[PDB]
Design an enzyme around this catalytic site. Structure first.
Site, short mmCIF file in Angstrom:
data_model
loop_
_atom_site.label_atom_id
_atom_site.label_comp_id
_atom_site.label_asym_id
_atom_site.label_seq_id
_atom_site.Cartn_x
_atom_site.Cartn_y
_atom_site.Cartn_z
N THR B 1 -6.35 44.60 -12.60
CA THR B 1 -5.22 44.08 -13.15
C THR B 1 -4.18 44.94 -13.47
OG1 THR B 1 -6.51 41.93 -14.07
CG2 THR B 1 -4.27 42.17 -14.76
N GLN B 2 -3.04 44.68 -12.92
CA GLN B 2 -1.75 45.41 -13.10
C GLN B 2 -0.45 44.79 -13.68
OE1 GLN B 2 -0.62 48.52 -10.28
NE2 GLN B 2 -2.68 48.99 -9.68
#
Ligand SMILES: *[C@@](C)(CO)[C@](*)(O)[C@H](CC(C)C)NC(=O)[C@H](Cc1ccccc1)NC(=O)[C@H](CC(C)C)NC(=O)[C@H](CCc1ccccc1)NC(=O)CN1CCOCC1
Ligand SMILES: *[C@@](C)(CO)[C@](*)(O)[C@H](CC(C)C)NC(=O)[C@H](Cc1ccccc1)NC(=O)[C@H](CC(C)C)NC(=O)[C@H](CCc1ccccc1)NC(=O)CN1CCOCC1
Ligand SMILES: *[C@@](C)(CO)[C@](*)(O)[C@H](CC(C)C)NC(=O)[C@H](Cc1ccccc1)NC(=O)[C@H](CC(C)C)NC(=O)[C@H](CCc1ccccc1)NC(=O)CN1CCOCC1
Ligand SMILES: [Cl-]
Ligand SMILES: [Mg+2]
Ligand SMILES: [Mg+2]
Lengths: 196, 233, 222, 204, 212, 125, 222, 195, 195
Positions: B1-2
């Site tokens: 997750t960015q």
């Protein structure tokens, strides 16, 4: 938005960019953010386009009704009407307005009205998202009692930098000059100000 | 997750009779701040491929390194590395497309939208898109971000289908790309005036143009616009 | 937060005849309100007279088709070039899909071909591997529009023999390849009119004992 | 808890040569539970026909409301209301409740007694008019109806032929929807005669 | 779905509907909700289609391996427990299954085991599983006796599914019947609810609430 | 881990380690099994060079694997305990999964399988 | 929706597509998005369909009453002011996005209004889901001193861009030309580039196909 | 509040309503009558949210009784059901709606016919041969589909009703402490004391 | 799963456990035995989360039976209860804990005394004269406080138990379909068939 108003020897000059955004889309690249509420009392609009328009329309109505009864209003009086609307409806408004006007007695005056609805009388004022990038520049370069040409260059250079760094600012640089002589509109295009 | 930090906006491209054209501006935005202005987002691989990248710049620089390492690895124990066994656009694309989909499948994507433009060994034009989700597609015109909304409509007026490709010259095609970049400068709030453009031709090869500017702009009509409705002054 | 899935739109359709089978699909690829491609095929010849399409999230669809094509390849290596029957392919695809039960391929999968008696066969899958053989199946964005039309025209549902007081049903019968393609073309033109994600082009893959033939037709581009 | 899909149901309307047809299913349920197989969704005020899908309490309420309004219209105007006029009344009444709307999908159908022209129209829950030459659809199987109508329909159908087309559109759409079915009714409307037929359909 | 299976004098009856839905969308009217584990064991399917299909096919493989190793048919108890122990390992992961493992052996006689995705395993005489289970229970309970004939038992199972198919929106299509004996199961046909309903209405005099 | 292949083939085709394990069995005390018409009897020798023994607590030669199956042995006593333990565990595991106690053939097949595994596993005798 | 407005020499022109959507479904393939506020003041509407119609009719009604009261032809700024104050009061909850244009004694005018009550002035404007496709064309081909015939071409070309490239827009092109000193001409279906092709088959059923339970004559008379 | 049933037969309407009143983990009462007589030939049973049920029933009762006194005339079951539906239809869009489901069983003296109306808290009215509210329907409807005939007697209806209660007592999770049964016919309303 | 009770008297331990198995709005079974024999003189009843209950009970049963075979000796109820507690104490800090509450009734042959242990899913053990799990305790405990004596016979214990079941059947909201009763004493475990 990037907006500013600067007092000088002969009166006051208002300045603004012409960008209106919806997210990252530019809904209008030739917007006029400098608006007349009275013959020689104008304002710079930042924040919500809907809120600032509705406010400016009401103020113009109030000052027209003021003039019919009591004659020409002061710039302080105009700023008070703006404040009253912005302060009393602070929960439902997103408006950062700079009020600027020319009296013959008081000469050029600048009042800034941030989000809360507070009033601040100043020699010059800057506001809008792009103003953050020119606090340093404007503080170092502003002088009191500048000439018309110096003030135009100050506003031009300042908004040029604001536009350069702020993605929410751009297009043309509009300016409105308020003096005893009258009202003068100025415009400056990208090809000029970008390479300053 | 960015979450993407330093970002690059639209990449636009199209096919023409003898090759492909691709373009992208030189900006690295930091949210609303137009932070970095000398960013090259077109990256050549060999003399027959150009990879245009939008989205997160840190991930773009990672992809640059992968492509650079790919060229090195292909040269190992390969006497025909500059001939028959040189890297093709199709090879380079499939590699990236594999990586992008593997990274999305690990819930740790490369936050990018990529267009691989080039010419194959047999002369055929290559133009294909891939993004952070691993989604791939090809079309006579391809564009990312705002370019998809504003450039594609303009480029599709030139090349609306496959049969329009032989009828489209490099002069006409470049003109359309340059026009599209101007429109994006008018209307995209995270765009810059400065951009790079690349042409990959089956005859004249790779032509990489740097430090281009949007010009012939229309701003004069702005002086006539006053107020927002009633105001006359 | 990062969302690993997407919707690439499009719709597909598989019909089975007596000695043939068709697998059609529009060539439009989309994201939100934008068109990505007007011609991006999603119906593939996978070998052994098996055609396949995985509609929905294109990245997952391409991965699945790619894996199945590879499954066919290794089936030949491991089992002396034996032909992979359509029923064996179906069961294999179930295991591919269910292998990702807890991180699914967001696709509706359809395959078509001929069974071991030479008769037309269509198999349809849900995203996690439940499958069923059928005469008729529409999948994708406009499946809800097309499928009840097929029920009416292919399987003759709700149609009774005139004059029989609604007592005698219209008799089931195999359709010709010509009549089937008419239904496919009319199905897609109707879906194109009323579904925004459907249009641009129609590509049909027909499967007979002779091999795999293709047919292409234009659709409205709005 | 989606008001438009609690009770279920569908309505469809079509035009033909000097005629119109309007049809509806008969189901009323509470989600999975089927409750009534006699719940008609088509009403008429003079020669103007109105079909209503959606939340059943609002279907009943609106019928009573338009009966109320059309009765007063007739007393004051000394004539029956026409489809074009009624369509506007429906739109006005629904938009009056813009921020607390009736959860319905109404459909107007009828023939203008003066001009003899066939007329149909559809609305969304807040009153947007959807006029059409060909057909109008509404309900929980609207997607299915759109698909059936778009393929089966052709212009200038005779009453007897139009009956078959609309009936098949409704039936096959209803069989692909869980919340619709359990019987059906079709109204065939000519200039000065109206036939009402109950269809035989699968009861699951 | 609606699925049932009950024990009686002549063995076991299994009856299911054939509807499958995705929300209100009816995906299929021709689904096989009875899965043939082997010539002697049946498994019903309710809940997740893939979960039931995949693991009950897998169960048949395990049952085949058992009789290869032990040279003897697997008990219904042992077969059901292989499935229940498997799904128990996946508990919390999100499997959705409500099945009935039905069989007839020498040592056990006719036996039914309800097995479900949260680990439950119950032996019993009567079970109804699915969105229309309550409707089927109503007809089944009021008409069930141990001394039912094979003909009457088959009809009761068929009639109970019809009852659910009628009322439950997510049940219908057709009825699949099975009779399970020691020598294996016997398929007793596919019965379209469309034709079956009107036939039963006329011959039985039931469903007066419906206009015929 | 210790990996050495201890059980291996010789030129003549014999696995000496397995054959030497048989010699250990030949050394062990005699054990006999006789099955009648309705019963089985397990007889076991106990050597008499050991006096001053406590027969209450001394490990018995015949061991219950379940309530219905028994296991006697000849050879290394310590080794037998490992097979008996494994067999007892498998007996309870069978009851748990199959819902039925082990057959004698099944239990034997399991124990024999364990013994075989130790003839071609690395690091074990 | 795609809607546009373009100013020219002696007046102003507005245009719109004709697609109405209900999610991914096309509800109306030929809806009219061009509205009359007064004879020579017309409005193009995007967004919530019921809101654009209701707000345009309300202001149009009040404009008529105002025109009668003042014995004057209505002005565009009056419609603009009345609309924005109405929309502002409802804080964006009335989802009407409008392009207002017309001619009056003051001259020719072109404005846009957004749901929250903000207005903009311009020589060329575009609103709706296809506004970016349209604006790209307008930014590419617009110039000062357009003729009537050039402005109609530019406007319809901008709408076409939306029709083809935006999935929210489609079907036909409506146009209204408001020239000074002349009556406004409403050009319904000015372009029809999305005609449905002939179907492959007729689906006219044999009479008696549908099973019937009951028949009855309905009484519509008194 | 939980189980309310209704069966219309040839010459009467039969209403059955559970006796249990439960709050938390305690059955506070096992002899509760979940019905009110609206008029001599009209009976209404009810079930739903605590407090709302009785408050609503008595409010309707008062209004119908007021009408009877004013006109010296008994409203038809159809008229009463329509009045009740409208009150619930108003209620659902109020600040705090009545969460009450009702069955209205009545005998129309002008038509000489029994009538059963089912109305839920939204104001959804249907005339039925047999009706139920809550989870009860999920068992009884399919049972009545099978066993119900339109020409049945009151005694046949009571046996049919016993069959429903038995099924509910077998398969329902909660103990509802049996039912109070009441019959509505040409001679008015009466209670069955032994059920 | 819901009601499990336990009463230790002079010479025996009596366990009572409800027969109902409910899922949703359906009673799937009304003859379920919620107990497993761990050893000839030790019985464990259980209640809690579906699947977990039986899986846990049988796992414990297998372990105790393994011990019995290995040592040719029966573990004391105290020893078995401690083993069970530790397994639950491990479980509560696992990835997915056993949500199972148990009663362990046993007769210690060395002490010649009956013993009742109450253990919840957290691993909370207590020896008691009488015990319950779930909502049952909220009625039975106060009842047993009043009527229970330590020197009671098995027959007196069964009458005391009948008094509890009657109170539960009167005041409990759910129908639990009666109870299966089992007695543990010097002669082992046996079931009361008529209760
Ligand atoms: C610079 C840009 C920032 O300081 C200036 O201040 C200018 C002021 C000029 C125009 C006088 N500000 C804007 O351009 C302003 C930015 C903004 C956005 C939201 C809140 C405050 C300020 N833009 C607008 O007001 C646009 C103008 C429209 C396009 C004509 N309006 C919107 O962006 C609306 C605003 C709704 C709203 C939110 C909160 C308070 C008041 C109004 N937002 C949207 O339409 C949302 N949009 C839907 C489509 O998906 C993307 C999001
Ligand atoms: C009655 C009919 C209703 O319960 C029965 O219980 C039947 C038993 C038959 C089908 C064996 N059950 C169903 O029909 C069952 C209902 C259900 C669905 C999901 C969970 C629990 C119960 N239906 C399905 O499982 C359908 C079967 C399809 C229509 C053939 N499948 C889906 O809904 C799939 C996968 C759902 C799913 C399960 C587990 C993890 C992830 C997803 N969903 C889709 O197909 C959705 N759409 C497909 C097209 O691509 C976009 C996604
Ligand atoms: C382009 C096509 C899309 O951007 C244009 O902007 C057009 C404008 C023209 C028609 C004037 N817009 C639409 O077509 C518009 C798109 C839309 C949808 C939803 C919200 C905002 C915009 N569509 C509509 O307005 C349709 C009109 C129908 C086809 C007659 N209406 C709906 O889709 C309504 C939405 C109503 C609504 C209520 C409250 C707030 C916002 C919108 N939705 C439904 O009818 C769905 N549903 C049916 C079952 O019953 C419950 C409601
Ligand atoms: Cl503005
Ligand atoms: Mg389009
Ligand atoms: Mg049904």
């Amino acid at each position: 938005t990037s907006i500013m108003a600067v007092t000088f020897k002969d009166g006051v000059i208002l300045g603004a960019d012409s960008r209106t955004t919806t997210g990252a889309y530019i809904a209008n690249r030739v917007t006029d953010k400098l608006t007349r509420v009275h013959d020689k009392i104008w304002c710079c609009r930042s924040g919500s386009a809907a809120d600032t328009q509705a406010i400016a329309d009401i103020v113009q109505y109030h000052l027209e009704l003021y003039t019919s009864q009591y004659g020409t209003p002061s710039t302080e009086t105009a700023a008070s009407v703006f404040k009253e609307l912005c302060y009393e409806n602070k929960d439902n408004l997103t408006a950062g307005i700079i009020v600027a006007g020319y009296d013959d007695k008081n000469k050029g005056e600048v009042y800034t009205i941030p989000l809360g609805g507070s009033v601040h009388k100043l020699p010059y004022a800057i506001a809008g998202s792009g103003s953050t990038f020119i606090y340093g520049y404007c503080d170092k370069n502003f002088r009191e009692n500048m000439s018309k040409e110096e003030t135009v260059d100050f506003i031009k250079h300042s908004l040029s930098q604001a536009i350069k760094w702020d993605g929410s600012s751009g297009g043309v640089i509009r300016m409105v000059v308020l003096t005893a002589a009258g009202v003068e509109r100025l415009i400056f295009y990208p090809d000029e100000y970008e390479q300053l | 997750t960015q979450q993407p930090i330093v970002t690059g906006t639209s990449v636009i491209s199209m096919k023409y009779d003898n090759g492909v054209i691709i373009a992208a501006d030189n900006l690295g935005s930091y949210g609303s701040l137009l932070r970095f202005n000398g960013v090259e987002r077109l990256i050549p691989v060999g003399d027959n491929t150009v990879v245009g990248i939008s989205g997160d710049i840190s991930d773009m620089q990672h992809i640059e390194r992968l492509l650079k390492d790919l060229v090195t690895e292909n040269a190992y124990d390969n006497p025909l590395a500059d001939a028959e066994e040189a890297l093709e656009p199709s090879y380079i694309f499939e590699y990236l497309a594999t990586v992008m989909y593997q990274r999305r499948s690990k819930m740790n994507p490369l936050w990018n939208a990529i267009i691989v433009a080039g010419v194959q060994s047999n002369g055929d034009q290559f133009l294909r898109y891939v993004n952070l989700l691993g989604v791939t597609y090809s079309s006579p015109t391809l564009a990312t971000g705002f370019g998809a909304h504003m450039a594609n409509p303009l480029l599709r007026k030139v090349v609306d289908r496959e049969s329009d490709i032989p009828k489209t010259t490099v002069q006409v095609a470049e003109e359309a790309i340059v026009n599209a970049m101007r429109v994006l400068y008018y209307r995209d709030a995270r765009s810059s005036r400065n951009f790079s453009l690349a042409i990959i031709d089956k005859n004249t090869g790779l032509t990489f143009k740097k430090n281009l500017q949007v010009e012939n702009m229309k701003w004069d009509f702005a002086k006539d616009i006053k107020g927002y409705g009633t105001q006359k002054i | 937060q990062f969302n690993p899935y997407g919707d690439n739109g499009g719709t597909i359709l598989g019909i089975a005849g007596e000695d043939f089978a068709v697998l059609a699909g529009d060539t439009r690829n989309i994201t939100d309100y934008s068109i990505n491609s007007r011609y991006e095929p999603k119906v593939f010849d996978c070998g052994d007279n098996i055609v396949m399409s995985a509609n929905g999230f294109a990245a997952d669809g391409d991965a699945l088709v790619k894996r199945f094509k590879n499954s066919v390849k290794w089936y030949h290596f491991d089992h002396n070039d034996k032909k992979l029957s359509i029923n064996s392919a179906a069961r294999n695809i179930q295991h591919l899909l269910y292998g990702k039960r807890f991180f699914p391929y967001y696709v509706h999968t359809i395959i078509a071909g001929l069974d071991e008696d030479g008769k037309g066969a269509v198999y349809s899958f849900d995203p996690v591997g439940s499958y069923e053989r059928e005469q008729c199946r529409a999948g994708g964005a406009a499946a809800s529009l097309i499928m009840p039309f097929l029920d009416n025209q292919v399987n003759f549902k709700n149609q009774y023999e005139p004059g029989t007081n609604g007592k005698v049903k219209k008799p089931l019968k195999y359709l010709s390849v010509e009549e089937v393609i008419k239904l496919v073309r009319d199905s897609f033109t109707s879906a194109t009119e009323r579904h925004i994600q459907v249009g641009d082009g129609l590509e049909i893959l027909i499967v007979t004992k002779d091999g795999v033939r293709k047919e292409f037709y234009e659709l409205k581009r709005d | 808890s989606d008001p438009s899909s609690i009770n279920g149901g569908i309505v469809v309307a079509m035009t033909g040569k000097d005629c119109v047809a309007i049809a509806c299913d008969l189901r009323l349920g509470s989600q999975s539970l089927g409750v009534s197989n006699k719940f008609e969704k088509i009403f008429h005020y003079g020669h103007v026909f109105l079909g209503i899908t959606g939340l059943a309490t609002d279907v009943t309420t609106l019928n009573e409301m338009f009966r109320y309004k059309t009765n007063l219209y007739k007393l004051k105007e000394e004539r029956a209301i026409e489809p074009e006029t009624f369509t506007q009344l429906v739109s006005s009444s629904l938009y009056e409740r813009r921020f607390g709307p009736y959860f319905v999908g109404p459909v107007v159908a009828g023939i203008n007694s003066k001009s003899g022209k066939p007329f149909i129209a559809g609305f969304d829950l807040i009153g947007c008019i959807d006029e059409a030459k060909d057909f109008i659809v509404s309900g929980t199987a609207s997607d299915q109806l759109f698909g059936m109508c778009e393929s089966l329909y052709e212009p200038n159908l005779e009453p007897e032929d139009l009956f078959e087309t609309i009936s098949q559109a409704l039936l096959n759409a209803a069989d692909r929807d869980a919340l619709s079915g359990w019987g059906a009714v079709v109204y065939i409307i000519k200039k000065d005669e109206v036939v009402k037929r109950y269809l035989k359909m699968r009861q699951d | 779905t609606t699925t049932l299976a009950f024990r009686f004098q002549g063995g076991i009856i299994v009856a299911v509907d054939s509807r499958a839905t995705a929300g209100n969308w009816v995906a299929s009217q021709t689904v096989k909700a009875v899965i043939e584990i082997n010539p002697f064991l049946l498994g019903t399917m309710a809940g997740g289609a893939a979960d039931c299909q995949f693991w009950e096919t897998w169960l048949g493989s395990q049952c085949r391996l058992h009789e290869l190793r032990e040279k003897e048919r697997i008990s219904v108890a042992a077969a059901s427990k292989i499935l229940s122990n498997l799904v128990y390992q996946y508990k919390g992961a999100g499997l959705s299954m409500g099945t009935m493992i039905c069989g007839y052996t020498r040592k056990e006689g006719p036996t039914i085991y309800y097995v479900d995705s949260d680990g439950t395993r119950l032996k019993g005489d009567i079970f109804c599983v699915g969105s229309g289970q309550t409707f089927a229970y109503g007809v089944l309970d009021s008409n069930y006796k141990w001394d039912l004939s094979v003909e009457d038992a088959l009809y009761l199972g068929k009639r109970s599914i019809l009852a659910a198919a009628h009322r439950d929106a997510y049940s219908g299509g057709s009825v699949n019947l099975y009779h399970v004996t020691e020598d294996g199961w016997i398929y007793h046909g596919n019965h379209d609810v469309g034709e079956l309903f009107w036939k039963v209405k006329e011959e039985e005099g039931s469903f007066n609430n419906v206009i015929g | 881990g210790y990996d050495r292949a201890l059980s291996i083939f010789s030129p003549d085709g014999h696995i000496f380690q397995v054959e030497y394990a048989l010699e250990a069995v030949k050394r062990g005390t005699c054990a006999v099994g006789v099955k009648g018409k309705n019963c089985v009897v397990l007889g076991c020798e106990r050597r008499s060079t050991l006096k001053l023994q406590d027969t209450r607590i001394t490990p018995s030669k015949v061991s219950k694997i379940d309530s219905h199956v028994v296991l006697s042995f000849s050879g290394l006593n310590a080794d037998s305990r490992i097979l008996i333990e494994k067999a007892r565990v498998e007996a309870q595991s069978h009851r748990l999964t199959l819902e039925d106690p082990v057959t004698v053939e099944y239990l034997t097949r399991y124990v024999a399988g364990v013994q075989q595994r130790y003839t071609q596993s690395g690091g074990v005798r | 929706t795609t809607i546009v407005g373009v100013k020219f020499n002696n007046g102003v022109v507005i245009a719109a597509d004709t697609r109405s959507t209900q999610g991914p479904i096309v509800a109306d393939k030929n809806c009219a998005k061009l509205h009359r506020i007064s004879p020579k003041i017309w409005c193009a509407g995007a967004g919530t369909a019921a809101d654009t119609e209701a707000v345009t009719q309300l202001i149009g009604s009040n404009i008529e009453l105002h025109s009668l009261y003042t014995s004057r032809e209505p002005r565009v700024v009056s419609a603009l002011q009345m609309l924005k104050q109405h929309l502002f009061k409802y804080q964006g909850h009335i989802g009407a996005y409008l392009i207002v244009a017309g001619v009056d004694p003051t001259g020719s005018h072109l404005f846009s209004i957004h749901a929250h009550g903000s207005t903009d002035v311009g020589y060329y404007l575009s609103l709706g889901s296809g506004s970016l496709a349209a604006m790209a064309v307008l930014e590419s081909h617009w110039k000062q001193d357009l003729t009537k015939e050039e402005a109609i071409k530019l406007a319809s070309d901008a709408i076409q861009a939306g029709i083809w490239n935006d999935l929210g827009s489609g079907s036909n092109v409506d146009v209204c030309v408001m020239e000074i000193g002349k009556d406004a001409e409403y050009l319904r279906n000015y372009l029809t580039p999305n005609v449905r092709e002939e179907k492959q088959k007729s689906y006219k059923f044999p009479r008696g196909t549908t099973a019937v339970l009951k028949e009855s004559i309905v009484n519509i008379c008194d | 509040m939980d189980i309310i049933l209704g069966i219309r037969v040839q010459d009467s309407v039969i209403l059955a309503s559970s006796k249990a009143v439960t709050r938390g983990i305690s059955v506070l009462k096992d002899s509760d009558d979940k019905t009110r007589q609206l008029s001599p030939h009209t009976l209404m049973s009810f079930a739903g949210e605590a407090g709302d049920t009785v408050q609503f029933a008595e409010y309707i009762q008062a209004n119908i009784q007021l009408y009877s006194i004013r006109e010296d005339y008994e409203l038809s079951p159809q008229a009463v059901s329509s009045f009740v539906r409208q009150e619930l239809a108003k209620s659902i869009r109020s600040r705090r709606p009545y969460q009450v489901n009702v069955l209205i069983g009545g005998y129309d003296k002008k038509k000489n016919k029994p009538e059963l109306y089912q109305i839920d808290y939204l104001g959804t009215k249907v005339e039925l041969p047999y009706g139920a509210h809550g989870y009860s329907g999920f068992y009884t409807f399919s049972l009545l589909d099978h066993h119900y005939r339109p020409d049945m007697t009151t005694e046949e209806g009571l046996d049919l009703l016993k069959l429903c209660v038995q099924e509910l007592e077998k398969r329902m999770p909660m103990d509802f402490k049996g039912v109070i049964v009441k019959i509505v016919d040409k001679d008015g309303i009466r209670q069955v004391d032994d059920f």
